[PDB]
């Protein structure tokens, strides 16, 4: 989830 957050946000 942190990686997905970095990418999208």
């Amino acid at each position: 989830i942190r990686n997905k957050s970095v990418i999208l946000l």
């Epitope: 989830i1 957050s5 999208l8």
Partner: antibody, heavy 124, light 114 residues
Framework: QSLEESGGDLVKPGASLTLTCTAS?????????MCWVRQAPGKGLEWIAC????????TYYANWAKGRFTISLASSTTVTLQMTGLTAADTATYFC?????????????????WGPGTLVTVSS | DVVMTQTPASVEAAVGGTVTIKCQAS??????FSWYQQKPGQPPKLLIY???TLASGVPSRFKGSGSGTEFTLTISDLECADAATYYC???????????????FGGGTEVVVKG
């Protein structure tokens, strides 16, 4: 492309159960997540977990689901959900869903493709 | 975890009319926000993603708007085929920690008055 869930059944409190989501018309590749969402009878949608479709196997979970639920990519066309410690609070239709994308590198964090659902009933 | 407060729980409007659904986020969220239509016995159908972009084949009488902590779905030129339960959904997360995921509103039942 389509999805179909299977494995729902009547199970006793305390039981474990594995659900399967089978993809047709595509196989998993990078650029999106595959996820499970459930819906108790007469209630709303509740997200459970996602897994990267890119082959890494990286997963992330709703806080309530950590420790009782595991999502896996079992093949290039199947996602599974292993559920444990089941109670009546877990009775629900369980949906498999594919995250949509408008570019090739990652998705847009909404679910564009859904299976019809499979029903899990936790009862004695 | 973000909580989406979706109102109203139910709404009725005439054929040809307009229904408006509001979703309020418990904290500021990004525009990775979506809306779904669910008919009984069917899975949800994605209507709008990124707050206001129409999914393929969805007509522009479905209009997603808003930002920050308040998002809105406006359904105009209502048809009997629009009778369904609608849900909002937020994606939320943190660049710093292993926190985030997907939060759904509680749903709005739409009754179309013919």
């Amino acid at each position: 492309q389509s999805l179909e869930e299977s494995g729902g059944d009547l199970v006793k409190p305390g039981a474990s159960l594995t659900l399967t989501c089978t993809a047709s018309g595509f196989s998993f590749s990078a650029g999106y997540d595959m996820c499970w969402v459930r819906q108790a009878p007469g209630k709303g949608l509740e997200w459970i977990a996602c897994i990267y479709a890119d082959g890494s196997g990286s997963t992330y979970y709703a806080n309530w689901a950590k420790g009782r639920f595991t999502i896996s990519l079992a093949s290039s066309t199947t996602v599974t959900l292993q559920m444990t410690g089941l109670t009546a609070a877990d009775t629900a239709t369980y949906f498999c869903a594919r995250e949509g994308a408008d570019g090739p590198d990652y998705g847009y964090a909404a679910f564009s493709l859904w299976g019809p659902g499979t029903l899990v009933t936790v009862s004695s | 975890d973000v909580v989406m407060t979706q109102t109203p729980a139910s709404v009725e409007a005439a054929v040809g009319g307009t229904v408006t659904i509001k979703c309020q986020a418990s904290q500021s969220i990004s525009n990775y926000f979506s809306w779904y239509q669910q008919k009984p016995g069917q899975p949800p159908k994605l209507l709008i993603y990124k707050a206001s972009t129409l999914a393929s084949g969805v007509p522009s009488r479905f209009k997603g708007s808003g930002s920050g902590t308040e998002f809105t779905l406006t359904i105009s030129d209502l048809e009997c085929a629009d009778a369904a339960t609608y849900y909002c959904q937020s994606f939320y997360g943190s660049v710093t920690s292993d926190y985030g995921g997907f939060a759904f509103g509680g749903g709005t039942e739409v009754v179309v008055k013919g």
